[PDB]
Structure 1
Amino acid sequence: PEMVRGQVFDVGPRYTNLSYIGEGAYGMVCSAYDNLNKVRVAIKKISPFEHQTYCQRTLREIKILLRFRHENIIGINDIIRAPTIEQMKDVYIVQDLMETDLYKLLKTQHLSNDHICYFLYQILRGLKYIHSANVLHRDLKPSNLLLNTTCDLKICDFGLARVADPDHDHTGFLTEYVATRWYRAPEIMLNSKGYTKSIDIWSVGCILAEMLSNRPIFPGKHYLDQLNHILGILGSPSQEDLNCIINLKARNYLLSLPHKNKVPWNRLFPNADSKALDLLDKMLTFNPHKRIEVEQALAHPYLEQYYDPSDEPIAEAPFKFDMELDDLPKEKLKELIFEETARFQP
């Protein structure tokens, strides 16, 4: 088998001439030449079978992406693995080769307002499809947004996704870790399990702010620091918004803080389009029930040049419940991954 940086990368003979790109959750990402379709592709190596949790993340993503079809979601073109469960040690997922990801792009490139508008439109258009499937992405961030050479955008990594469950979202204070820290909504640290669509809208708001300035808007240094950064910009929550937090530990933590003033968005982003800042404000709303929803965001005046609901499709077959991966030992999960990937054999 071909080898990349000392590690097996067993994709051949269809896929040749490999180059290292970067890193997925359970393995590396390479580009490769597809000798059948005569185009270069991206390939992610996954090695999950020694851990139940890794198998869960692998299976959820495969189940979701084998159903989803959308221009702003990077799909699965092929899946490579050994012909038998006994021999299967790794799984490789083959996807379109993009040019860069938004994390890397934002390290060195300033975006024009037209680019921010188009990128944000495409994020929300993809998100509308995801949420219409009753699914939450739950880890939206710049490195999960891929761009091709003409700046078409696709959303990557559904390994952390869940079926939405708003009626079971409440929990206690300082217990939840959903998403990546800088993109985590304030209620995750207060009283939410991350099972409502508003969790993703917050992340998109953080991404929009980051496109406006090339710096993360809420760069918490560690888990507990994150809420300091959010409140330092949004200011103290209103009485109404506190009254929506019935949990006493969370509400009393907020009541114990000194008053903090809101920082005006146009002072943080003096170059920004005023319509972009109005939408930013609605996405980064503290109260998740007041936070804008994906279809409202698409209709916002900032996006008027692109908005077209008839060209913003929804999912045919929403997911009705989570596949119930808890407590399934990794052995049954391996067998389920083997089964879900059979369509790509031989």
Structure 2
Amino acid sequence: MENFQKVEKIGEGTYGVVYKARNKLTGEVVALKKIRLTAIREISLLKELNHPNIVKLLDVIHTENKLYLVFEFLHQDLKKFMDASALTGIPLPLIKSYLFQLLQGLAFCHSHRVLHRDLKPQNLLINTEGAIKLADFGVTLWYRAPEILLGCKYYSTAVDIWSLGCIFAEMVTRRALFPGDSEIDQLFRIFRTLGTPDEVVWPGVTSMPDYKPSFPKWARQDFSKVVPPLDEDGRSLLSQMLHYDPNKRISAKAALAHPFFQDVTKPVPHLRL
């Protein structure tokens, strides 16, 4: 750990603080996650999870009551980019590219039974090359899947698809889709837009740990009202990413074959660093 010089604090990650740091021998600029404290075996496996759309775990340093994770560094997160793009909005071709690449990263994760669990614009990283990467995996509730909010203990890869749908919508409209500030408010914001789920659209839902028969019964809103000005292909894909039933929610693999991605390209973003 004495091999690393702090450049600056990036922020709080899931299990500790992330810093931009430099390796004193090589000169490598990295993102160093300091975890404060079988997990060692779990992380060892994460090091093998290599993909162009996953931030590279370079090294794991287990020294003391201390665990440091040395990751690849990227210059910007998607939230910052969205914020900087808020006057014009991110161009649709760039939205489409970012969505497509994230679905590739997730299809890869998911094929290895690895879930992200906490996808949000603040943990999606971009570079000048036009790439976007999944990071900070292996409180904001805005992106949480409804099965989690309803107390599912053993949730599935479908949770990441839900989160990515919310992010997709947000890139298009320049507004957070479901900006809740408590679990119930989050849940009720979802219910008010998509309709209160019942046994018809989500078999099993009334059986969930925190489902209450006494939940208000709201009607589904018209979907063309939710994400203007997204085209029919985009709205169709989004609706499949936001299905209530986790088992009917589209997989990352199937989403990549959606007609929305017929004309996908890889634009370069204009980043001010």
Q: TM-score band, normalised by the shorter chain?
A: 0.7 to 0.9
Unaligned runs of 5+ in 2: 266-273
Which residue of the other structure, out of 85, 93, 117, is the alignment partner of 2:69? Answer: 93
What fraction of aligned residue pairs are identical, expressed as a percent? 38
Query: 1:276–1:302: 8 Å Cα contact kept in structure 2?
Result: yes
Alpha-carbon spacing, 1:240–1:81, altered in 2? closer, same or farther (3 Å)? closer
Query: 1:242–1:251: 8 Å Cα contact kept in structure 2?
Result: no
Residue 169 of structure 2 corresponds to 209
TM-score, normalised by the number of residues in structure 2: 0.84
Per-residue CA shift, 1:135-190, capped at 9, x if unaligned?
2221111122111122311111224xxxxxxxxxxxxxxxxxxx952112122233
Supply the distance in 2 between the matched residues of 1:150 and 1:81 (Cα, whole angstroms): 33
Supply the distance in 1 between the matched residues of 2:212 and 2:257 (Cα, whole angstroms): 37
Query: 1:138–1:194: 8 Å Cα contact kept in structure 2?
Result: no
Alpha-carbon spacing, 1:198–1:33, altered in 2? closer, same or farther (3 Å)? same
SS at match of 1:44: strand
SS at match of 2:31: strand
> In the alignment, residue 32 of structure 2 is paired with which amino acid?
I
SS at match of 1:302: helix
Which 10-residue stretch deviates more, 101-110 or 293-302? 101-110
Per-residue CA shift, 1:18-69, capped at 9, x if unaligned?
2222222343222223345444221111211xxxxxxx7x647613422211
SS at match of 1:289: coil
Residue 100 of structure 2 corresponds to 121
- C-alpha displacement at 1:209, in angstroms? 1.2
Cα RMSD, aligned residues only: 2.6
Which residue of the other structure, out of 216, 238, 249, is the alignment partner of 1:257? Answer: 216
SS at match of 1:136: coil
Supply the distance in 2 between the matched residues of 1:111 and 1:77 (Cα, whole angstroms): 31
Unaligned runs of 5+ in 1: 1-10, 49-55, 83-87, 160-178, 308-346
- C-alpha displacement at 1:227, in angstroms? 1.2
Residue 252 of structure 2 corresponds to 294
Supply the distance in 1 between the matched residues of 2:252 and 2:141 (Cα, whole angstroms): 22
Alpha-carbon spacing, 1:195–1:251, altered in 2? closer, same or farther (3 Å)? closer
- C-alpha displacement at 1:195, in angstroms? 2.3
Which residue of the other structure, out of 78, 85, 105, is the alignment partner of 1:102? Answer: 78
Whose helix proportion is higher, 1 or 2? 1
Is 1:12 the counterpart of 2:27? The answer is: no
- C-alpha displacement at 1:112, in angstroms? 1.0
Alpha-carbon spacing, 1:92–1:233, altered in 2? closer, same or farther (3 Å)? same
| 1:39-78 → structure 2 map (5 Å cutoff) | 39-48=28-37, 59=40, 62-78=43-59
SS at match of 1:67: coil
Is 1:29 the counterpart of 2:10? The answer is: no
Residue 269 of structure 2 corresponds to none
> In the alignment, residue 183 of structure 1 is paired with which amino acid?
Y
Alpha-carbon spacing, 1:189–1:79, altered in 2? closer, same or farther (3 Å)? closer
Query: 1:103–1:143: 8 Å Cα contact kept in structure 2?
Result: yes
Query: 1:186–1:227: 8 Å Cα contact kept in structure 2?
Result: yes
- C-alpha displacement at 1:239, in angstroms? 5.0
Report how many aligned residue pairs link the two structures: 262
> In the alignment, residue 97 of structure 1 is paired with which amino acid?
F
Residue 135 of structure 2 corresponds to 156
Supply the distance in 2 between the matched residues of 1:233 and 1:116 (Cα, whole angstroms): 23
Query: 2:148–2:155: 8 Å Cα contact kept in structure 1?
Result: no
SS at match of 1:28: strand
Supply the distance in 1 between the matched residues of 2:208 and 2:249 (Cα, whole angstroms): 22
SS at match of 1:70: coil
Query: 1:73–1:156: 8 Å Cα contact kept in structure 2?
Result: yes
Residue 221 of structure 1 corresponds to 181
TM-score, normalised by the number of residues in structure 1: 0.68
Supply the distance in 2 between the matched residues of 1:211 and 1:227 (Cα, whole angstroms): 21
